[PDB]
Design a protein around this ligand. Structure first.
Ligand SMILES: CCCCCCCCCCCCCCCCCC(=O)OCC(COC(=O)CCCCCCCCCCCCCCCCC)OC(=O)CCCCCCCCCCCCCCCCC
Ligand code: HEA
Ligand code: HEA
Ligand SMILES: CCCCCCCCCCCCCCCCCC(=O)OC[C@H](COP(=O)([O-])OCC[N+](C)(C)C)OC(=O)CCCCCCCCCCCCCCCCC
Ligand SMILES: CCCCCCCCCCCCCCCCCC(=O)OC[C@H](COP(=O)(O)OCCN)OC(=O)CCCCCCCCCCCCCCCCC
Ligand SMILES: CCCCCCCCCCCCCCCCCC(=O)OC[C@H](COP(=O)(O)OCCN)OC(=O)CCCCCCCCCCCCCCCCC
Ligand SMILES: CCCCCCCCCCCCCCCCCC(=O)OC[C@H](COP(=O)(O)OCCN)OC(=O)CCCCCCCCCCCCCCCCC
Ligand SMILES: CCCCCCCCCCCCCCCCCC(=O)OC[C@H](COP(=O)(O)OCCN)OC(=O)CCCCCCCCCCCCCCCCC
Ligand SMILES: CCCCCCCCCCCCCCCCCC(=O)OC[C@H](COP(=O)(O)OCCN)OC(=O)CCCCCCCCCCCCCCCCC
Ligand code: CUA
Ligand SMILES: [Cu+2]
Ligand code: NA
Ligand SMILES: [Zn+2]
Lengths: 79, 43, 54, 227, 95, 514, 46, 259, 75
């Protein structure tokens, strides 16, 4: 468990100025954990931390559009 | 570059007339269009 | 029959080569500059009408 | 912020604006040295009356005239790289702000927890309260805590903007389809004024930025009151 | 399949024919190659041909030198380079 | 008799004459736009209203002064008048493309003037960055007309560059090497090389921008997977070679002027001059992302780009110290073009060191899009390139026209121009340091005083070009011709007379190798 | 053949001083007065 | 008179007409995209084809009939067209740089992978491979035509250059048929944009090369080319090999890699 | 080198038979696939400015058999 999430940490994998790929990959990892815990049937909410990570990084408009195109089924990310 | 004497030498009065002509020919249209910007803004 | 035209294009005339053939290149030059002048003035009219809104 | 008859930079609040200001003083001393060299040499070497207009040794001073500007150029370059590498180190920040520049107004999201968002427009000139600053005052000032590393992600919805505050030493492009990092700290509380640097239409002069830096307890009270 | 295509010794006319016909015997009246017969003395000067009364003459008079120096050369006896004094004479009869 | 001499011209002197006339007209357009810009910034408030018309004026000032005043006059006019004269060629290699390049220029000017006239107006800066220059913020025909203006100017300069390179390499006398040519011929060669290696990059960039605007491609907007940093990459990959196109024939002109009026038979370190010009040309292609230090690049990328900017800084230092060294111990004749050349040396040195201040990426993060950059590029462009233009014009106006200017009016013109442009662009350093950014029609009150000072300096510079016209008229008000010219043995263009005849070098030069 | 000499290699006659003064001032004044009328047009439109 | 071997051109009007014709094209594109008028565009297209025909016929008249083409003149012409080829190389290199920056780092809106989702790229081992084979075979046939010109054979040259033109026309109509039966359009994102701009500019350049080849064919059949002074045909071979090299970089870059 | 008859036989051995069997290989692989199901992506079928030929929705090479539209297919 890595909760008491006060803000996002410094990710060593993408350490440069552009932080687009952090929120794209973190939202993708959150949905892929949703899929993996749906197929496994175990605890989904243990990767609830991933959710808060994208909630800190890419804006409300980007996230809202992505929920719209995952609700309709127009998501280019292979989840 | 050394030079001829002027074939048609210019008096000082004609140089003054020429520079006054250049100044008035440059500041009449630009001076007129900047005399009223507010009239172009639908007064 | 290139060398007879080679003889023909030796000037002895004081005329440029784009008016050297005689009739047909002269009239199609004539039409070329006429239609490009008409196109240029129609470009100026088109640009003035495009600058004016409605 | 700028005061009348100001010649140099604005005074520093972040650490990096202090190191960049010291480096600016260093490189401007170097500029003054080279400019005085060129000016004094040309004023010396025009005013002579002696002459020498014959064949001269072509290559006998070129190695010195190529090694000395290389020495001064690396003398500029090493502190430049030293402070260049001191903007993207490990930060471990405290807060994360998300700033989106819409068509001539800024917008601010504090959604680390308890999602909060608002819009910053300019207070108009005829609607100014007395004592205020023309072309710089905003509706909602952007409230940040004191002396802590604050992660800040800048973007725009439609066109190119530039979120810039000079006295904190921040200037970062706001590009659509992008997300740009800037860490922001402080040392003094108060109000810092910046404005957009990228050309963004017919009101490009008319988006200001006001950063109001306060202690952390007052930032917590402001976050509780604003939501 | 035999020949067919023309050879430029008979098809080509005009200025190309004139310089090819002149250059098959080692003559360059139309100045494609650098000239010859070089000696700086006043008894055997550098001879230049022309078709007019004067010609621009450019001198590299010491080797590995940047700037050519140019001067007019007229008829009569030989003039010379203004800094080195290699003798240049004009024989205006060529075509 | 007129349309065959001028409209259908096939010799280089006439093309250079019309280049000089067109550039003088376009420069007067540009200084009118500059008077407009300093007119709105003179006092606080909105003289013209919104920032859209001001941005249209700013973009027009940039494009007219870049592609229509320095490039045609400098490259086309001085190259066509002097390059076949210094190398001893009878004409250009392809004179018909030279004529077509000149006659392609005023269509591009008319398209730009129409671009300013359509109901939107191309108010985006001379950087035509999307998505501001898209069909959403600028829905109209102004950006397309500006794009086609740049297309026509690029085709013109590509044709001129091809003609210049083939006429320099091929039309030498067969005994001369390339290293025995004058320095302005070298500057024209290197400028034409960088022109035809650089211009297709912006041609492809504005082609892709036009297809984004009108063919629904998504090269640049991120809604379809595009990226505007790609446009900035392509534009500045053209744009810094374009910068060195602006500055390099000025280097050749000042080398010739200082060598002539200093009494020297050669510039000191001719091989150093040639090597430094080759180095500046070769290193202009690897330093473009110093225009992109705040866009969000890698830290290692910007470290490389500021380092490569220092290595492009060294060989122009070699050039300026060699100019000082060829000033050493000569018969200094204080001609007007001498004063223009020394003003070039000092003020271009100041502009170069302000560029060196901008070279560091950290102080570029502080000083991006401020008026410190504006002071830098005006101290190089509007002072170095303009002073080199005026030095060449004052020096070779006896060769072109056949008449000599009044030297006293010329020195007065230099003094007025010097004071005016120095008081114009020195407070902009303080305006950039204080933090008032670019492209603004209205500023806070704290930036008032310097702006006020800057505005009135422009008017002094305006008066300068006014009396410059008087200068030209006074020459034709005097009709004094030339005795002869000193140092005509070393300079080939002066040895056929002032002005030279229509047919020069019918009997070519006689230079031997053996 | 075209004219050779001083003042004849130019596309305009320099043989009259005052006519050339008027021609120069209308040429360069039209150049100076084009963008001001452009700005007048953009202000008159909106 | 004249003693230099450089050609002095008579005062010719095709510079002015070509320049104002380019003005007509630019104004015609602006009037077509926005105000929807096609007459000015077609007037400009007619003006370029007339001006170019007269310019190049004048060059033919002064070259093969008046004999103004001394060896320094075709040395200069070689320099000029080599420079033009290098300029077009850097134009296509700018387009290639656009494609490489597009496909090197895919974005979040595309989905983070190349090719994007919802597109079906062309499999490279079918008829694009036939286009590569056709262009290479036309290069080999034009090299046979060049050696038949240098060796002095006329009918072998006619057969070689005829099949060169035939494969050029076959290549451009095969490419046009692939523009017909492709499964994605120019509005299908950055992949479609880069693909169709790169292939369309290559198609325009190969139809320009085909036109230059057919006018070279009629010049050869009118006995213009001699044994060694045949610079227009060497120009055709150089531009044709340039188009072949550009298509080889296109097929390795876009068609095969990433698809 | 610099032969003439060897390049004619080089063409007639390598080039024209090569294009011949490549055309035969394209003939044996001349089989179309089914039309894929239409999913309305927003990074595809970009409509910012209408086209300037005919209607404005069709592209220049828009064949209705395989190419889609932003509002589905065509029937
Ligand atoms: C019969 C009547 C008398 C004989 C004709 C002379 C007058 C009419 C004319 O065709 O006059 C001749 C024309 C010549 O102009 C041309 O031939 C074409 C000019 C193209 C300008 C394009 C501007 C932009 C147009 C599109 C917008 O003169 C002009 O129109 C104005 C020139 C005024 C003087 C300019 C001085 C420049 C000084 C600086 C450069 C010195 C160079 C020395 C060398
Ligand atoms: C004449 C045109 C011209 C010339 C020559 C230059 C020359 C240079 N330019 Fe400039 N530049 C522009 C025109 C020009 N520029 C324009 C028009 C822009 C605006 C683009 C925009 O709108 O964004 C611009 C922008 C620009 C920026 C963008 C800043 C920003 O907005 O973020 C930068 C920063 O790197 C820069 C740098 C330089 C440098 C380092 C040089 C150097 O080449 C200068 C040469 C250096 C010298 C002459 C130094 C003198 C050296 C000596 C005397 C030897 C001794 C030296 C030492 C010992 C160190 N230029
Ligand atoms: C050639 C380039 C050039 C030249 C000369 C100038 C000259 C001047 N510029 Fe310009 N300027 C730019 C290129 C140039 N500028 C560019 C590229 C920008 C950036 C635009 C952007 O932000 O996108 C810019 C931006 C710019 C701004 C920014 C506006 C803003 O962003 O808010 C301002 C305002 O201060 C300004 C002012 C001036 C002034 C007062 C002059 C004065 O020097 C005017 C005096 C000039 C002349 C008088 C011309 C010289 C000609 C002659 C003397 C006659 C020649 C004829 C013969 C010899 C026959 N310039
Ligand atoms: C910390 C303490 C102080 C350290 C001081 C020394 C630091 C030196 C760093 C120099 C840059 C090294 C680097 O990684 O560069 C990346 C760059 C990367 O450039 P690039 O080719 O990737 O640029 C394209 C950029 N994008 C991807 C955004 C389109 O490497 C190079 O350019 C070449 C290798 C390094 C060259 C370094 C010397 C430059 C001067 C000579 C040039 C010739
Ligand atoms: C008022 C503006 C017009 C002034 C006209 C004038 O005074 O002209 C006289 C003079 C003309 O030149 P001048 O000195 O006679 O001879 C050239 C010197 N080598 O003019 C000058 O020398 C310029 C000084 C003008 C002072 C005003
Ligand atoms: C020619 C010289 C080279 C160009 C210099 C351009 C930069 C510049 O002028 O910077 C302003 C400089 C530093 O400003 P500073 O003195 O720190 O202001 C705050 C306290 N007075 O200010 C100074 O150096 C003093 C004022 C300008 C002197 C010139
Ligand atoms: C777009 C404009 C294209 C213009 C063009 O193709 O011009 C061809 C040019 C004409 O022939 P040119 O050599 O100028 O004739 C004078 C002496 N022979 O031909 C040449 O100058 C030689 C080939 C140059 C090709 C440049 C193409 C751009
Ligand atoms: C094209 C430009 C667009 C505008 C058209 C302008 C047409 C001409 C009008 C301007 C020139 C003119 O007529 O100026 C009036 C001037 C009067 O003569 P004035 O100057 O008093 O005599 C010299 C003694 N100070 O008249 C003159 O100076 C002209 C007479 C001078 C002598 C001419 C001799 C001709 C011999 C044949
Ligand atoms: C795109 C623009 C650029 C296209 C490519 C231009 C290539 C130019 C090549 C060089 C032209 C030139 O001046 O060549 C010199 C040559 C004279 O020498 P030559 O004929 O070889 O000597 C024979 C002696 N027995 O003269 C010739 O060879 C002239 C004859 C060949 C020129 C024909 C040009 C045809 C161009 C076709 C494409 C046109 C595209 C634009 C117009 C249509 C648009 C839809
Ligand atoms: Cu946002 Cu300027
Ligand atoms: Cu640069
Ligand atoms: Na204002
Ligand atoms: Zn000598």
């Amino acid at each position: 468990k890595i909760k008491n999430y006060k803000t996002a940490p410094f990710d060593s994998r993408f350490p440069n100025q552009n932080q687009t790929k952090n929120c794209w990959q973190n939202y993708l990892d959150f949905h892929r954990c949703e899929k993996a815990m749906t197929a496994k049937g175990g605890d989904v909410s243990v990767c609830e931390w991933y959710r808060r990570v994208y909630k800190s990084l890419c804006p409300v408009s980007w996230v809202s559009a992505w929920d719209d195109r995952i609700a309709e089924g127009t998501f280019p990310g292979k989840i | 570059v050394s030079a001829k004497p002027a074939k048609t030498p210019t008096s000082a009065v004609e140089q003054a007339v020429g520079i006054s002509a250049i100044v008035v020919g440059f500041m009449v249209p630009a001076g007129w269009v900047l005399a009223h910007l507010e009239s172009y803004k639908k007064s | 029959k290139v060398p007879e035209l080679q003889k023909f294009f030796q000037k002895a005339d004081g005329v440029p080569i784009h008016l050297k053939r005689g009739l047909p290149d002269q009239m199609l030059y004539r039409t070329t500059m006429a239609l490009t002048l008409g196109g240029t003035i129609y470009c100026l009219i088109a640009l003035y009408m495009a600058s004016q809104p409605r | 912020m700028a005061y009348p008859f100001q010649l140099g930079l604005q005074d520093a609040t972040s650490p990096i604006m202090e190191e960049l200001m010291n480096f600016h003083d260093h490189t401007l001393m170097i500029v003054f040295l080279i400019s005085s060299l060129v000016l004094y040499i040309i004023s010396l070497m025009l005013t002579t009356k002696l002459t020498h207009t014959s064949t001269m040794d072509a290559q006998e001073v070129e190695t010195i005239w190529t090694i000395l500007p290389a020495v001064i150029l690396i003398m500029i370059a090493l502190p430049s790289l030293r402070i260049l590498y001191m903007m993207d180190e490990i930060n471990n920040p405290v807060l994360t702000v998300k700033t989106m520049g819409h068509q001539w107004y800024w917008s601010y999201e504090y959604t680390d927890y308890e999602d909060l968002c608002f819009d910053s427009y300019m207070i108009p000139t005829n609607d100014l309260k007395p004592g205020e600053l023309r072309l710089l005052e905003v509706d909602n000032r952007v409230v940040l805590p004191m002396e802590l590393p604050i992660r800040m992600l800048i973007s725009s919805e439609d066109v190119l903007h530039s979120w810039a505050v000079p006295s904190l030493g921040l200037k970062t492009d706001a590009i659509p389809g992008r997300l740009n990092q800037a860490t922001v700290t402080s040392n003094r509380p108060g109000l810092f004024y910046g404005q957009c640097s990228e050309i963004c239409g017919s009101n490009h002069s008319f988006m200001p930025i006001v950063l109001e830096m306060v202690p952390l307890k007052y930032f917590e009270n402001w976050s509780a009151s604003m939501i | 399949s035999g020949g067919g295509v023309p050879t430029d010794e008979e098809q080509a006319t005009g200025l190309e024919r004139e310089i090819m016909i002149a250059a098959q015997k080692g003559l360059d009246p139309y100045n494609m190659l650098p000239p010859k017969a070089a000696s700086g003395t006043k008894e055997d000067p550098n001879l230049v041909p022309s078709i007019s009364n004067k010609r621009i003459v450019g001198c590299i008079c010491e080797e590995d030198n940047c700037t050519v120096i140019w001067f007019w050369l007229h008829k009569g006896e030989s003039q010379r380079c203004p800094n080195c004094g290699t003798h240049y004479k004009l024989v205006p009869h060529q075509m | 008799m007129f349309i065959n001499r001028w409209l259908f011209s096939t010799n280089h002197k006439d093309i250079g004459t019309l280049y000089l006339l067109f550039g003088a007209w376009a420069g007067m357009v540009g200084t009118a736009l500059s008077i407009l810009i300093r007119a709105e910034l003179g006092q606080p408030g909105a003289l013209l209203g919104d920032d859209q018309i001001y941005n249209v004026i700013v973009t027009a000032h940039a494009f007219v002064m870049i592609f229509f005043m320095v490039m045609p006059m400098m490259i086309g006019g001085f190259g066509n008048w002097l390059v076949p004269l210094m190398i001893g060629a009878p004409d250009m290699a392809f004179p018909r493309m030279n004529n077509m390049s000149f006659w392609l220029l005023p269509p591009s000017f008319l398209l730009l003037l129409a671009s300013s006239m359509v109901e939107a107006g191309a108010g985006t800066g001379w950087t035509v960055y999307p998505p501001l220059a898209g069909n959403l913020a600028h829905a109209g025909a102004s950006v397309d007309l500006t794009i086609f203006s740049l297309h026509l100017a690029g085709v013109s300069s590509i044709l001129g560059a091809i003609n210049f390179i083939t006429t320099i390499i091929n039309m030498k006398p067969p005994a001369m090497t390339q290293y025995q040519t004058p320095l302005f011929v070298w500057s024209v060669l290197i400028t034409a090389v960088l022109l035809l290696l650089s211009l297709p990059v912006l041609a492809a960039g504005i082609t892709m921008l036009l297809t984004d605007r009108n063919l629904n491609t998504t090269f640049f907007d991120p809604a379809g997977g595009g990226d505007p940093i790609l446009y900035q990459h392509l534009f500045w990959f053209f744009g810094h070679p374009e910068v060195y196109i602006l500055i390099l024939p000025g280097f050749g002109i000042i080398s010739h002027v200082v060598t002539y009026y200093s009494g020297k038979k050669e510039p000191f370190g001719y091989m150093g001059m040639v090597w430094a010009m080759m180095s500046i040309g070769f290193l202009g292609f690897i330093v473009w992302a110093h225009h992109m230090f705040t866009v969000g690049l890698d830290v290692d990328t910007r470290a490389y780009f500021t380092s490569a900017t220092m290595i492009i800084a060294i060989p122009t230092g070699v050039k300026v110290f060699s100019w000082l060294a060829t000033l050493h111990g000569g018969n200094i004749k204080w001609s007007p073009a001498m004063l223009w050349a020394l003003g070039f040396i000092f003020l271009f040195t100041v502009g170069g060191l302000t560029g060196i201040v901008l070279s560091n990426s950290s102080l570029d993060i502080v000083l991006h899009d401020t008026y410190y950059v504006v002071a830098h590029f005006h101290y190089v462009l509007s002072m170095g390139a303009v002073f080199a233009i005026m030095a060449g014009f004052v020096h070779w106006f006896p060769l072109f026209s056949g008449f000599t200017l009044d030297d006293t009016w010329a020195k007065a013109h230099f003094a007025i121009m010097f004071v005016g442009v120095n008081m114009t662009f020195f407070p902009q350093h303080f305006l950039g340091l204080s933090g008032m950014p670019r492209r603004y029609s209205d500023y806070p009150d704290a930036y008032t005083t310097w702006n006020t000072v800057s505005s009135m300096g422009s008017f002094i510079s305006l008066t300068a070009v006014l009396i410059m016209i008087f200068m030209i008229w006074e020459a034709f008000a005097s009709k004094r011709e030339v005795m002869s010219v000193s140092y005509a043995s070393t300079n080939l263009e002066w040895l056929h007379g002032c002005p030279p005849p229509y047919h020069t070098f019918e009997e070519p030069t006689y230079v031997k190798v053996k | 053949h075209y004219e050779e000499g001083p003042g004849k290699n130019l596309p305009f006659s320099v043989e009259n001083k005052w006519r050339l003064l008027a021609m120069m001032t209308v040429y360069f004044g039209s150049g100076f007065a084009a963008p001001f009328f452009i700005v007048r047009h953009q202000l008159l439109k909106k | 008179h004249q003693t230099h071997a450089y050609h002095m051109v008579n005062p010719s009007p095709w510079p002015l007409t070509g320049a104002f014709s380019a003005l007509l094209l630019t104004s015609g594109l602006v009037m077509w995209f926005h105000y929807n008028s096609i007459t000015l565009l077609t007037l400009g297209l007619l003006t370029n084809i007339l001006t170019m025909y007269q310019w190049w016929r004048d060059v033919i008249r002064e070259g093969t009939y008046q004999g103004h083409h001394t060896p320094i003149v075709q040395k200069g012409l070689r320099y000029g067209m080599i420079l033009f080829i290098v300029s077009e190389v850097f134009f296509f290199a700018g387009f290639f740089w656009a494609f490489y920056h597009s496909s090197l780092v895919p974005t979040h809106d595309l989905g983070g992978c190349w090719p994007p989702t919802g597109i079906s790229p062309l499999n490279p081992l079918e008829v694009p491979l036939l286009n590569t084979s056709v262009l290479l075979a036309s290069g080999v046939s034009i090299t046979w035509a060049h050696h038949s010109l240098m060796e002095g054979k006329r009918n072998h040259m006619n057969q070689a250059l005829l099949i060169t033109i035939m494969l050029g026309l076959y290549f451009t109509i095969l490419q046009a048929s692939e523009y017909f039966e492709t499964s994605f359009s120019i509005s299908d994102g950055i992949y479609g944009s880069t693909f169709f701009m790169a292939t369309g500019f290559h198609g325009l350049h190969v139809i320009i090369g085909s036109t230059f080849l057919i006018v070279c064919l009629l010049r050869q059949l009118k006995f213009h080319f001699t044994s060694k002074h045949h610079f227009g045909f060497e120009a055709a071979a150089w531009y044709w090999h340039f188009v072949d090299v550009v298509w080889l970089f296109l097929y390795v870059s876009i068609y095969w890699w990433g698809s | 080198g610099a032969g003439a008859n060897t390049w004619r036989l080089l063409t007639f051995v390598l080039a024209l038979p090569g294009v011949a069997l490549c055309s035969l290989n394209c003939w044996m692989h001349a089989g179309h696939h089914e039309r894929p199901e239409f999913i309305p992506y927003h990074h595809l079928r970009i409509r910012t400015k209408p086209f300037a030929w005919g209607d404005g929705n069709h592209t220049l090479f828009h064949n209705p058999h395989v190419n889609p539209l932003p509002t589905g297919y065509e029937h």
